[PDB]
Amino acid sequence: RHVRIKNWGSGMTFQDTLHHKAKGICLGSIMTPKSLTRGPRDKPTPPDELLPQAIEFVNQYYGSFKEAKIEEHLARVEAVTKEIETTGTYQLTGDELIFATKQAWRNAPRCIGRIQWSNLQVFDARSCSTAREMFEHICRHVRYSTNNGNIRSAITVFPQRSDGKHDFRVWNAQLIRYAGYQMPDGSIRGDPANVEFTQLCIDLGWKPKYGRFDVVPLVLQANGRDPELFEIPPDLVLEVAMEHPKYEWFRELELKWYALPAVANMLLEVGGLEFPGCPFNGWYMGTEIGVRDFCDVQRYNILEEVGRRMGLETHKLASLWKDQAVVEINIAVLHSFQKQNVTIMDHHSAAESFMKYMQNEYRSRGGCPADWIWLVPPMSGSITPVFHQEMLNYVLSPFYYYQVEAWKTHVWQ
Amino acid sequence: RHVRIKNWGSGMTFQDTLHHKAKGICLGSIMTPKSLTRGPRDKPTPPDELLPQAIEFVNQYYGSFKEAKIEEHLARVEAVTKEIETTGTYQLTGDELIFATKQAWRNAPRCIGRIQWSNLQVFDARSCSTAREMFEHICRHVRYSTNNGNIRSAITVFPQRSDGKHDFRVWNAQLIRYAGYQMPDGSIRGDPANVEFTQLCIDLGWKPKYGRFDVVPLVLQANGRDPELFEIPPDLVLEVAMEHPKYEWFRELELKWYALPAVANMLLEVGGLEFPGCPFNGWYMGTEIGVRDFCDVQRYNILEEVGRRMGLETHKLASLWKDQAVVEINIAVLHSFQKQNVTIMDHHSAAESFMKYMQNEYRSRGGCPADWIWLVPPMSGSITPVFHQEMLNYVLSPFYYYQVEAWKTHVWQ
Amino acid sequence: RHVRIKNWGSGMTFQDTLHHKAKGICLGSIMTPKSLTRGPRDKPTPPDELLPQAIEFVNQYYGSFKEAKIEEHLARVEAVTKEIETTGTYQLTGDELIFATKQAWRNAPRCIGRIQWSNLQVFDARSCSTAREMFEHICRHVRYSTNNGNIRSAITVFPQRSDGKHDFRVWNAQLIRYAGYQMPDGSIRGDPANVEFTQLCIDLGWKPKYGRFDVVPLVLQANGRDPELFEIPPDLVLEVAMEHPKYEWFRELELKWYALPAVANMLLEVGGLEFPGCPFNGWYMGTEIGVRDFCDVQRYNILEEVGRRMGLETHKLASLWKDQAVVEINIAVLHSFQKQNVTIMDHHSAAESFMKYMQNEYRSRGGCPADWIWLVPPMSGSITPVFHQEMLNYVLSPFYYYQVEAWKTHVWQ
Amino acid sequence: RHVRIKNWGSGMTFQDTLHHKAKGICLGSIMTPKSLTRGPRDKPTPPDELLPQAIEFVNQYYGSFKEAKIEEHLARVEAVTKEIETTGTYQLTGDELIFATKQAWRNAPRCIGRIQWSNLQVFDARSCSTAREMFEHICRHVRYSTNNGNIRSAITVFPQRSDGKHDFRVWNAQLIRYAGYQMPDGSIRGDPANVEFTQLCIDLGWKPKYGRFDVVPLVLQANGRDPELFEIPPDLVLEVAMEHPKYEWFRELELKWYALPAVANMLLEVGGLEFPGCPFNGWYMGTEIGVRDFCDVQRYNILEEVGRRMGLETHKLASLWKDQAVVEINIAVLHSFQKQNVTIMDHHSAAESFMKYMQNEYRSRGGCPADWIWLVPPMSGSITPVFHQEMLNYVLSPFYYYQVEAWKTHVWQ
Ligand code: HEM
Ligand code: HEM
Ligand code: HEM
Ligand code: HEM
Ligand SMILES: Cc1cc(N)nc(CCc2cncc([C@H](CN)Cc3cc(C)cc(N)n3)c2)c1
Ligand SMILES: Cc1cc(N)nc(CCc2cncc([C@H](CN)Cc3cc(C)cc(N)n3)c2)c1
Ligand SMILES: Cc1cc(N)nc(CCc2cncc([C@H](CN)Cc3cc(C)cc(N)n3)c2)c1
Ligand SMILES: Cc1cc(N)nc(CCc2cncc([C@H](CN)Cc3cc(C)cc(N)n3)c2)c1
Ligand SMILES: C[C@H](O)[C@H](O)[C@H]1CNc2nc(N)[nH]c(=O)c2N1
Ligand SMILES: C[C@H](O)[C@H](O)[C@H]1CNc2nc(N)[nH]c(=O)c2N1
Ligand SMILES: C[C@H](O)[C@H](O)[C@H]1CNc2nc(N)[nH]c(=O)c2N1
Ligand SMILES: C[C@H](O)[C@H](O)[C@H]1CNc2nc(N)[nH]c(=O)c2N1
């Protein structure tokens, strides 16, 4: 049974059926609902409970293939059953893992970038062992993805959970993020969103360097142990200085940003197994840096200042000065990234492509999970076509769930 | 059960309890869910189930007063219970109404303009009997709200619902909307969302004027009977012609819009009762006209034209040429409404005043129902505090529901 | 002894030999130098001193012909001597007259229109005797030249002056002009520059209408007699109402002007004869009305008002507000004229057309008399080629001279 | 004898007597006429042709002081007479020079700045001895007058002409001026009026830089010797980059202009002495950059382009596009110089003051020598009072004369 949804802009309608295949988990605009969280545990998933899911994942994987693969399918099911019954858990083939990481992306309902899903570099780092080693893998990763400014998407997978006590985790939210500091006059220099995390880093040893853009160290957690700190060697963090193609004074704001956006603190779910260490990256969309990173009040908040030097009437709020200023900032980001041969995509182009993605999804697998709230751009929203797209939002499997900030639960062994 | 609600903008965090007294009706971004609709009926609501709700609301009414008048309260509940007795339904004092309209405004979650909820003008018209009287009651409503420039808000309540066979309802979307016509060569002229309806109007005998800004006539329904067209007198329609502070050429586009946004076809629910005609108006928000009306591909869609006219790089999408037009078009709208002294609200001031309201509502009733998707303005979203506010969405009584539009069910006499 | 003459704009460089013929009469920018006036006299030009000037002209006339008839040159030269000896004066042949009016035009150093000179209607009114009769020829001239808006150049020539005591003249500076009146409160209303003359008319019987554009009557003198008033029928007075093509409000200044510019008060000198009655007209140049008639402080003086009305910064001198208004008014004039199918020439075309003329003159007769001060338009001067053209000013024969205005010398019967 | 002259705008007339004192020298609109030029010579000015002129000046000087200085005056008259009897020439006191330069400024009849005359830095450089020494002096002068943007007027005076074989002159017509080059395909780059000169320096060994705004070298001539080239230190050449305050695109024209207008190539006459080296500067009038430098066909010629940039009907003349652009360019010039904090006066302000200057001169020496052709701005002429003022032109003494340009008449060592 089918659910009707309409693109009010084109009149085109899809019939969504893939929903009636969803894990059945209005908590309305909540950023991190419980429904999308996967907490810690501390005994391994009951093996009885894991079995049906593993058959289901094996079944998904095999029915992904061009011709039927009967022989090897039946083989794999038996194989997997025995493995769980005898060992409590199971291991997945090198391929299975590729397929899952790609599928879980495809299933991520907040990612506008999804047209790229079939195209994802998969770093199998499951046999990883000290934080020493986690750090090395993460560099192998950043080097590949930064690709001399021609960003590519890639994922690095650290060994499954077992226990719920021997977790491999990156504690940082993103691989590369700017520090933020509470200054003695009560003011915040740096990135206010990160005041808390940086404190943690300082507490754990890091020398606080008191600057607008200091890159915070990796906080790496091997086998559930206490975390250890590593600094990403600077020449692997690729950055872009902001300038504006018309306004000189832009350069004087002395603004820059990193090229590579990588989520680190999220957990991957596959046929019942959980990986709490999987950092993945794509490339940036204009507005993320422009609108958010630079104009959000709780991030860099450069909006007021720019209005002032565009000489706008920053006091009559009705003059739309704020909107003008946003747009200039956003041109500046794109322009800088282009003037520099560093991959980046504007929100219009993104949305356009997402519409094509959404189209083939319905055409090919009967559906497409999507968070409208997340997918419609932080700026000039109803000008993009996704704005007028009725969309359904649901949890499939494989899937990327958020977990609980690691420090919130860790026991300092 | 108290539910946590954060404003990632400031940090300020609300507790929410009000959700609990919501007779609890992911249908994600669906424009009109069945959840939010009030269908047609052919019998009157059963004695049995109409009484509990009748009581419910009288309760609300009284425990909202100066203090608490104890036996108007038992003598009003005496009244109602014995009123359902002898004709199985009931009346509301010329005054329980003033309350429930103001209350159901307070309760409509998509309205960003709810700081003004107590400042409403109630036009009692529940006695009214030809459609041609409906017409006059509406023109009172209009001349009043238009107020020669300075807009005030008003609702007009028509007779409730007996058999359902005898409904009083306006078929229009809003009172003032522009007609849309499908031209000989297949092209469209006017407001293209309204083609549909303009068509219907013509079939009911309206002479089409084949013009971009023609005001479509009222289609009116006297208790059940077929509908009759009455055109509004042209000088009860206040309109603003568009021009730009900086762009003399903007006039050349010859664009204008109406002063007054009113909603004809929603149904009010009050402690059990249903009123299928209750038009209500407020004043316009900048974007509704600037962004939405003018820029939407399925509306006037002038964006391409304005960018040619500002000579931007209208072929390189990533030049943000779209985002600039949209700003400039909106300054035009905002500026034109000041130049001709007509109440208008830019989307910032709206947002801010909403945030103040939302704060009040959580302070004084422990909850504020809000549909994030509708409240965040259609341009420059994240530059308005509401974007960063987590919100809960729920239906209370009294409430304004959408109906299936008359022409689709109404049995043709 | 040719004089070098450089056009700094082009670099092109003429050699003037025609100044050698100048009757050799720094009076820098004086509007009416003594040497361009022909005063009254009160005895005929002495037979003696006239004779050579008559021959003079005669050779110049015949030496003008393509052909060259020697025996007619002699026949004419003979007729003339034998005419001057016996009458004391001579008579021009009809044809000689055409030639002479045309030549004096060519010889008018202040007239940018000269490209047109070979092409000019000549009305012979030398046999005229009553003032009423003068008035008839004049309306013939006006209907002819007005030509339903397609203006044509023409001159009407009244009886030569005989003894200086029997002059036929028009006292009016121009055939069509608006009255200026001195109001009781100090202020002036109408054409301030014309208060003076208006007064005289009132004095001779005319009823003042106290209106901004009131057409003054004709003040006509027939051989010596006190002048008489006739009003040109409103039908022969073609006018144009100013509107601007972007500013509706322009029409609110209720401005108009007349289509026909005719100098009436000047004196033609041919071969020692003086005709002090000879009005001639051409078509208007934009700027004459736009810059001069409307913006001269001592004329209609509308400039400040057009300023306020356009919204410019009219107390900051440096804002160039004075210069923007003058451009817009000047457009209104051209626009208005086009709009009503009435010949008008803008000052740019005029400039260029003069340059083509000047150059032909240098080619064909070795010189071209030219008053730089009068020829360079009253706005955007250096933008016209005549500005960078070095010129010589000098008096040839025939020639149009200024006269001492009649009322200043006339003795009244 | 008195000479009456009218201001047609104001009605006001002066009578002029100062002209009787003019050393008695139509040479019509000639830029650089014989009568205002001052020959080279090869003998000293014969002593007793000098004498009457020396007494004359000495008389003027003492006559300038508020209270008769009888003794000191007589002393100086004999002083001088002796000096001439015995040396065949004379020196003038440091003070007399200060007085002369100012008087001669007052007497230069083409300078609308003259309102300032009483107010001039006078660099005595009469002791000067080499071309290098000349260069030294000229910098003192530029750093002084440039005065950090706040322009001040100054004159530097090099040693009087002796036998006029040992002249001291700067061959450059102005101090700072841009080179103009004739490019290989005959197009002209830079300042086309300046081509032939720039070629001269190229030939005296300047390395041509082939840009738009190349500052030319100084061509210096000491003691009649051949000249030598010096380049002004670039940081003494203050320039203004041009931007319109409404049109961003203006900045894209990439125009700038120097801040200091200094005339070198003129000769000072005082009491029969000739100074062939006296460079003077004042500050700019808007128009001479905006209208002339930027719009003359023979200059930077931008008009066509700005027209295109502005959407104007550059193909239909009568649209007055040309007039509209010349305005905006001019605004840009003033606005640029104002924002960059550099003295400039606009042509209305200029003219309004000349008018006060004139009116004082009449009040107080019975005259004011004025070239109307040069005084009336190259734009909106009629809109400035001077257009309407009849003015007399004549040569007093002291006086700044023009010279045969040095390269025409230099005996090449
Ligand atoms: C072609 C490259 C990609 C682009 C252009 C892109 C674009 C985006 C953007 C703009 C967001 C929202 C970011 C924000 O709100 O702060 C997002 C969210 C997300 N994307 Fe992507 N994406 C890309 C690749 C990926 C990849 C490779 C994965 C993992 C396989 C992924 C999974 C997600 C997830 C899980 C979110 C949720 C955001 C959160 O709460 O942190 N995306 N994507
Ligand atoms: C005080 C003036 C008012 C302002 C400024 C205002 C503002 C707005 C805005 C901007 C919208 C969204 C428009 C759209 O998306 O098409 C809206 C929708 C709405 N408002 Fe208001 N409002 C006002 C008065 C009222 C009143 C008097 C009522 C009823 C008593 C009301 C109930 C609603 C409802 C139910 C909607 C949803 C409309 C729909 O789905 O068609 N508002 N309001
Ligand atoms: C094609 C038609 C003509 C045009 C466009 C034209 C243009 C002009 C203009 C623009 C002026 C200056 C007006 C002012 O500043 O007051 C002028 C002055 C003059 N033109 Fe013409 N002209 C035309 C025909 C004639 C004719 C037919 C004659 C006589 C044969 C003539 C002789 C003069 C004279 C004598 C002046 C100086 C008049 C004065 O001081 O009032 N022009 N002309
Ligand atoms: C307040 C300062 C001054 C201003 C604003 C000013 C303004 C002007 C202007 C606009 C011109 C016409 C320039 C042109 O068409 O190229 C001019 C010409 C002239 N001014 Fe000045 N002036 C100033 C000071 C001086 C000084 C200090 C002198 C010499 C002492 C001077 C002597 C002249 C001379 C001789 C000319 C004739 C220009 C030529 O053909 O080279 N002015 N002045
Ligand atoms: C794969 C990828 C691609 C891309 N273009 N951008 C990204 C952005 C990742 C990111 C960076 N900085 C902040 C965020 C989000 C806030 N916008 C993370 C977040 C924060 C919070 C408080 C809740 C939540 N659910 N998610 C996400 C990831
Ligand atoms: C009371 C009031 C105030 C105000 N400022 N603006 C308005 C706008 C009313 C309006 C005008 N034009 C179109 C609409 C709605 C779209 N936003 C119509 C609509 C269409 C559909 C398919 C669903 C829906 N729920 N509503 C609403 C109403
Ligand atoms: C034949 C012709 C053509 C044309 N296009 N314009 C005209 C303008 C005639 C005109 C109209 N209004 C005033 C004037 C002149 C000043 N502009 C009159 C005049 C006045 C004074 C005080 C002195 C003088 N020499 N000339 C002339 C004539
Ligand atoms: C002291 C001073 C002040 C000021 N505001 N402007 C100036 C003008 C400097 C200047 C710059 N470029 C050209 C000129 C003159 C053109 N108006 C040059 C010139 C050329 C010719 C051929 C003749 C002539 N007499 N004068 C002058 C000087
Ligand atoms: C499909 C999607 O829900 C639809 O385009 C909605 C989105 N948000 C909106 N928000 C407001 N305020 N008004 C609207 O019409 C819409 N349209
Ligand atoms: C309250 C609300 O959920 C929150 O501010 C969200 C809204 N939508 C978003 N959408 C994206 N893509 N990224 C964000 O950070 C947010 N913030
Ligand atoms: C004083 C000066 O001669 C007078 O204002 C002149 C200037 N130049 C002119 N030039 C033309 N063509 N017409 C005029 O009236 C004038 N007026
Ligand atoms: C030919 C004419 O004299 C030449 O183009 C003059 C005109 N008037 C001028 N007036 C000023 N002030 N400066 C100039 O260069 C000129 N040029």
Side-chain angles (χ1 to χ4, degrees), chain A residues 29-31 110 285 292 296 373-378, chain B residues 6 8 372 386-391:
Chain A
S29 57
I30 304 302
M31 290 206 93
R110 305 176 143 172
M285 185 181 64
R292 305 318 287 283
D296 285 16
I373 308 232
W374 277 66
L375 288 174
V376 182
Chain B
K6 189 183 225 192
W8 299 94
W372 197 95
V386 276
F387 178 108
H388 321 275
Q389 178 84 60
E390 274 170 355
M391 35 197 67

CSV table of all heavy atoms in Angstrom, one decimal, chain A residues 29-31 110 285 292 296 373-378, chain B residues 6 8 372 386-391, ligand 10:
chain,number,residue,atom,x,y,z
A,29,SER,N,10.5,19.4,15.0
A,29,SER,CA,11.8,19.8,14.6
A,29,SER,C,13.0,19.6,15.6
A,29,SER,O,13.8,20.5,15.8
A,29,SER,CB,11.8,21.3,14.4
A,29,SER,OG,11.3,21.9,15.6
A,30,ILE,N,13.0,18.5,16.3
A,30,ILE,CA,14.1,18.2,17.3
A,30,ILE,C,15.3,17.8,16.6
A,30,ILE,O,15.3,17.0,15.7
A,30,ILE,CB,13.7,17.0,18.2
A,30,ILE,CG1,12.3,17.3,18.9
A,30,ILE,CG2,14.8,16.8,19.2
A,30,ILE,CD1,12.3,18.6,19.7
A,31,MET,N,16.4,18.5,17.0
A,31,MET,CA,17.7,18.2,16.2
A,31,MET,C,18.1,16.7,16.3
A,31,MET,O,18.5,16.2,15.3
A,31,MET,CB,18.8,19.1,16.7
A,31,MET,CG,18.5,20.5,16.2
A,31,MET,SD,20.1,21.2,16.0
A,31,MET,CE,20.5,20.9,14.3
A,110,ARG,N,18.9,13.3,5.8
A,110,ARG,CA,19.3,14.8,5.9
A,110,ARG,C,20.4,15.2,4.9
A,110,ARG,O,20.7,16.3,4.7
A,110,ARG,CB,19.7,15.1,7.3
A,110,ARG,CG,18.7,14.7,8.3
A,110,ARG,CD,19.0,14.9,9.8
A,110,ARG,NE,17.9,15.3,10.5
A,110,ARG,CZ,17.8,15.4,11.9
A,110,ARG,NH1,18.8,15.1,12.6
A,110,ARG,NH2,16.7,15.9,12.4
A,285,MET,N,28.9,22.5,0.9
A,285,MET,CA,27.9,23.3,0.2
A,285,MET,C,28.0,24.8,0.6
A,285,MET,O,27.7,25.1,1.7
A,285,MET,CB,26.5,22.7,0.4
A,285,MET,CG,25.4,23.4,-0.4
A,285,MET,SD,23.7,22.8,-0.2
A,285,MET,CE,23.5,23.2,1.5
A,292,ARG,N,25.8,29.6,7.8
A,292,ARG,CA,25.9,29.0,9.2
A,292,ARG,C,27.1,29.4,9.9
A,292,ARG,O,27.1,30.1,10.9
A,292,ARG,CB,25.8,27.5,9.1
A,292,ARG,CG,24.6,27.0,8.4
A,292,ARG,CD,23.4,27.8,8.9
A,292,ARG,NE,23.0,27.4,10.2
A,292,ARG,CZ,22.4,26.3,10.5
A,292,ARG,NH1,22.0,25.5,9.5
A,292,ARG,NH2,22.1,26.1,11.8
A,296,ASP,N,25.3,32.5,11.7
A,296,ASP,CA,24.7,32.1,13.0
A,296,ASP,C,25.3,32.8,14.2
A,296,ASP,O,26.5,33.0,14.3
A,296,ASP,CB,25.0,30.6,13.2
A,296,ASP,CG,24.1,29.7,12.3
A,296,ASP,OD1,23.5,30.2,11.3
A,296,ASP,OD2,24.0,28.5,12.6
A,373,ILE,N,13.1,19.6,6.7
A,373,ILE,CA,13.7,20.6,7.6
A,373,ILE,C,15.2,20.7,7.4
A,373,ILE,O,15.7,21.8,7.3
A,373,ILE,CB,13.5,20.2,9.0
A,373,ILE,CG1,12.0,20.0,9.2
A,373,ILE,CG2,14.1,21.3,9.9
A,373,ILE,CD1,11.3,20.8,10.3
A,374,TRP,N,15.9,19.6,7.3
A,374,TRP,CA,17.3,19.5,7.0
A,374,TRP,C,17.7,19.7,5.5
A,374,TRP,O,18.8,20.2,5.2
A,374,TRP,CB,17.9,18.2,7.5
A,374,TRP,CG,18.3,18.4,8.9
A,374,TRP,CD1,17.4,18.5,10.0
A,374,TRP,CD2,19.6,18.4,9.5
A,374,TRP,NE1,18.1,18.6,11.1
A,374,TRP,CE2,19.5,18.6,10.8
A,374,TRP,CE3,20.9,18.3,8.9
A,374,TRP,CZ2,20.6,18.6,11.7
A,374,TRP,CZ3,22.0,18.4,9.8
A,374,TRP,CH2,21.8,18.6,11.1
A,375,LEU,N,16.8,19.4,4.6
A,375,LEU,CA,17.2,19.5,3.2
A,375,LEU,C,17.1,20.8,2.5
A,375,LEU,O,17.8,21.1,1.6
A,375,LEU,CB,16.5,18.4,2.4
A,375,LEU,CG,16.9,17.0,2.7
A,375,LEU,CD1,15.9,16.2,1.9
A,375,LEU,CD2,18.3,16.7,2.2
A,376,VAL,N,16.1,21.6,3.0
A,376,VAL,CA,15.9,23.0,2.4
A,376,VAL,C,16.9,24.0,3.0
A,376,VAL,O,17.0,24.1,4.3
A,376,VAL,CB,14.5,23.4,2.8
A,376,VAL,CG1,14.3,24.8,2.2
A,376,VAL,CG2,13.5,22.4,2.2
A,377,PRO,N,17.8,24.6,2.2
A,377,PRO,CA,19.0,25.4,2.4
A,377,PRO,C,18.8,26.6,3.4
A,377,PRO,O,17.7,27.2,3.4
A,377,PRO,CB,19.3,25.9,1.1
A,377,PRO,CG,19.0,24.8,0.2
A,377,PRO,CD,17.6,24.3,0.7
A,378,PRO,N,19.8,26.9,4.2
A,378,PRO,CA,19.6,27.9,5.3
A,378,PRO,C,19.4,29.3,4.8
A,378,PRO,O,19.2,30.2,5.6
A,378,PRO,CB,21.0,27.8,6.0
A,378,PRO,CG,21.6,26.5,5.6
A,378,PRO,CD,21.2,26.3,4.2
B,6,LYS,N,14.9,23.1,23.0
B,6,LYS,CA,16.0,24.0,23.0
B,6,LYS,C,16.0,25.1,21.8
B,6,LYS,O,15.6,24.7,20.7
B,6,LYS,CB,17.3,23.3,23.0
B,6,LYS,CG,18.5,24.2,23.2
B,6,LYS,CD,19.8,23.5,23.2
B,6,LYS,CE,20.7,23.9,24.3
B,6,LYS,NZ,22.1,23.4,24.2
B,8,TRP,N,18.7,26.6,19.9
B,8,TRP,CA,20.1,26.5,19.7
B,8,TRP,C,20.7,27.8,19.4
B,8,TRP,O,21.9,28.0,19.4
B,8,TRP,CB,20.4,25.5,18.5
B,8,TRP,CG,19.9,24.1,18.8
B,8,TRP,CD1,18.7,23.6,18.4
B,8,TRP,CD2,20.7,23.1,19.5
B,8,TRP,NE1,18.7,22.3,18.9
B,8,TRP,CE2,19.9,21.9,19.5
B,8,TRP,CE3,22.0,23.0,20.0
B,8,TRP,CZ2,20.3,20.7,20.1
B,8,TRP,CZ3,22.4,21.8,20.6
B,8,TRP,CH2,21.5,20.7,20.6
B,372,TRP,N,7.2,24.2,12.4
B,372,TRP,CA,8.5,24.8,12.0
B,372,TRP,C,8.6,25.1,10.5
B,372,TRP,O,9.0,26.2,10.1
B,372,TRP,CB,9.7,23.8,12.3
B,372,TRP,CG,11.0,24.4,12.3
B,372,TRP,CD1,11.7,24.9,13.4
B,372,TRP,CD2,11.9,24.5,11.2
B,372,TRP,NE1,12.9,25.3,13.0
B,372,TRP,CE2,13.1,25.0,11.6
B,372,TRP,CE3,11.8,24.1,9.8
B,372,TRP,CZ2,14.2,25.3,10.8
B,372,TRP,CZ3,12.8,24.3,9.0
B,372,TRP,CH2,14.0,24.9,9.5
B,386,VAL,N,13.7,32.0,14.6
B,386,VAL,CA,12.8,30.8,14.6
B,386,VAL,C,13.5,29.5,14.0
B,386,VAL,O,13.1,28.4,14.4
B,386,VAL,CB,11.5,31.0,13.8
B,386,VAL,CG1,10.5,31.6,14.8
B,386,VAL,CG2,11.6,31.8,12.6
B,387,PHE,N,14.4,29.6,13.0
B,387,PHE,CA,15.0,28.5,12.4
B,387,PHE,C,15.7,27.7,13.5
B,387,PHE,O,15.7,26.5,13.5
B,387,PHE,CB,16.0,29.0,11.4
B,387,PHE,CG,16.8,27.9,10.7
B,387,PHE,CD1,16.6,27.6,9.4
B,387,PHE,CD2,17.8,27.3,11.4
B,387,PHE,CE1,17.3,26.6,8.7
B,387,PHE,CE2,18.6,26.3,10.7
B,387,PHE,CZ,18.3,26.0,9.4
B,388,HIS,N,16.4,28.4,14.4
B,388,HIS,CA,17.2,27.7,15.4
B,388,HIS,C,16.3,27.2,16.6
B,388,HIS,O,16.8,26.5,17.5
B,388,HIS,CB,18.4,28.5,15.9
B,388,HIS,CG,19.1,29.2,14.8
B,388,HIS,ND1,20.0,28.6,14.0
B,388,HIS,CD2,18.9,30.5,14.3
B,388,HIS,CE1,20.4,29.5,13.1
B,388,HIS,NE2,19.8,30.6,13.3
B,389,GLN,N,15.0,27.6,16.6
B,389,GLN,CA,14.1,27.1,17.7
B,389,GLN,C,13.5,25.8,17.4
B,389,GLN,O,12.9,25.5,16.4
B,389,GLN,CB,13.1,28.2,18.0
B,389,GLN,CG,12.1,27.8,19.1
B,389,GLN,CD,12.6,28.1,20.5
B,389,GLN,OE1,12.9,29.2,20.9
B,389,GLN,NE2,12.7,27.0,21.3
B,390,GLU,N,13.8,24.8,18.3
B,390,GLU,CA,13.1,23.6,18.3
B,390,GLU,C,11.6,23.9,18.6
B,390,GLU,O,11.4,24.6,19.6
B,390,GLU,CB,13.7,22.6,19.2
B,390,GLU,CG,14.9,21.8,18.7
B,390,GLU,CD,15.6,21.0,19.8
B,390,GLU,OE1,15.2,21.1,21.0
B,390,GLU,OE2,16.5,20.2,19.5
B,391,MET,N,10.7,23.3,17.9
B,391,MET,CA,9.3,23.4,18.1
B,391,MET,C,8.5,22.1,18.1
B,391,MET,O,8.9,21.1,17.4
B,391,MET,CB,8.7,24.5,17.3
B,391,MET,CG,9.2,24.6,16.0
B,391,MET,SD,8.8,26.2,15.3
B,391,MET,CE,9.7,27.3,16.3
E,10,LIG,C1,15.7,23.7,15.4
E,10,LIG,C2,16.2,23.1,14.1
E,10,LIG,O1,15.9,21.7,14.0
E,10,LIG,C3,17.7,23.4,13.8
E,10,LIG,O2,18.1,24.7,14.1
E,10,LIG,C4,18.0,22.8,12.4
E,10,LIG,C5,17.0,23.2,11.3
E,10,LIG,N1,17.5,22.6,10.1
E,10,LIG,C6,18.8,22.4,9.8
E,10,LIG,N2,19.2,21.9,8.7
E,10,LIG,C7,20.5,21.7,8.4
E,10,LIG,N3,20.7,21.2,7.2
E,10,LIG,N4,21.4,21.9,9.3
E,10,LIG,C8,21.1,22.4,10.5
E,10,LIG,O3,22.1,22.6,11.4
E,10,LIG,C9,19.8,22.7,10.8
E,10,LIG,N5,19.4,23.2,12.0
